[PDB]
Chains A and B, each alone.
Chain A
Amino acid sequence: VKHNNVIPNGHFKKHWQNYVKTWFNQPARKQRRRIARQKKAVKIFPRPTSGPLRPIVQCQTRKYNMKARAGRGFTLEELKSAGIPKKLAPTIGISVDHRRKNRSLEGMQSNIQRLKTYKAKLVIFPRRARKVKAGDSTPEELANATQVQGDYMPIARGEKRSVEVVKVTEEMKEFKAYGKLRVERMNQRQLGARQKKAAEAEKEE
């Protein structure tokens, strides 16, 4: 080792040349997946090629909780509130997730509206030729039906940027933003000592 360089740290002490992965088959991977998608599209026609409907969820972890993305499936309550029976939804194009929870009302409301929005623009062919049972559709509807492609219900990742104009009022100018943060941090760290001094009050006092 010699002149002012960075400390070398390459991990090449094993038999690494036996596990080299090259990517010469990358263009062929794209073609096989394209043929796979195209062949799948015909075998599901007229069902949409994006797949079943996915609900709106907030992401986890501070860094991303301000961003909305597609989740696995609708909860049981979202399905029941929109009146889509549990065992019928996957058969008509709606995914289910028996594991997800509804802790905040707004999230539940948003995903309910998707199910009605999906139900509104959903059309279902009969299970046989002429019999029309519940949930089927008019022949006019079933001729106007095509294989929609792409994202037929897009998900906006987050809040659109808006810079409004308001009037700066006297209360707004008096508010101490930094003072509020420091006193609220203070309360958090004194929580135990305050509760302990309180707790020992009823033990002794």
Chain B
Amino acid sequence: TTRFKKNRKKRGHVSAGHGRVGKHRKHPGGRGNAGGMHHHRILFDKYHPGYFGKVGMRYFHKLSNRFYTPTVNVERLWSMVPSDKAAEAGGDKAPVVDVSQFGYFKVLGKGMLPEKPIVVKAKLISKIAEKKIKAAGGAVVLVA
């Protein structure tokens, strides 16, 4: 929107806002990230520490799919239960949630669970996640 650009308010002002002494010159500091270790060293060290150097080890031909493990916490397992089936239950009778049908591979343990037992059926799980599920009275099932 050219009508709100501020250069339209500096018309009639000689320098267009860039100063009389230090002008608007072409590339007075160099182009791009020139001088990251010479004359932009303070800026690179201050705002981007860790920028220079080589850490760790290479992984020729990395495929992301090999590393895919979506995760869900136990605090979110009861939104997964439909209400009518959340009603059908006894003290020993609990719903079973295949988190694999919701796109999750591992179950993590953040958050609280209600007293109602649950049977989480997952590919992977953490220590605490099963410790919290058992403490609610439910069980864990491993699948593939």
Contacts and interface: CB of A to CB of B under 8 A. Distances in A.
B113 interface: no
A165 B88 contact: yes
B68 interface: yes
Given A8-B32, A173-B139, A175-B140, A161 B88 contact: no
B48 interface: yes
The B interface is mostly helix, strand or loop, or mixed, namely: mixed
Interface in A108-128: none
A46 B65 CA distance: 42
A168 B32 contact: no
Given A7-B51, A166-B93, A167-B93, A161 B102 contact: yes
Interface in A44-84: 61-64, 66
A4 B94 CA distance: 53
A1 B40 contact: yes
Interface of A is mostly: loop
Contact of B95 (A1, A163, A172): A163
B111 interface: no
Nearest to B88: A165
Given A167-B90, A168-B119, A168-B138, A162 B101 contact: yes
10 contacts: A1-B34, A1-B40, A2-B43, A63-B65, A66-B100, A161-B101, A167-B93, A172-B141, A177-B141, A178-B127
Interface of B: 29, 32-34, 40, 43, 46-48, 51, 63-66, 68, 80-82, 85, 88-90, 92-98, 100-102, 117, 119, 122, 124-127, 130, 134, 137-142
Interface of A: 1-2, 4-5, 7-8, 61-64, 66, 158-168, 172-173, 175-178, 180-181
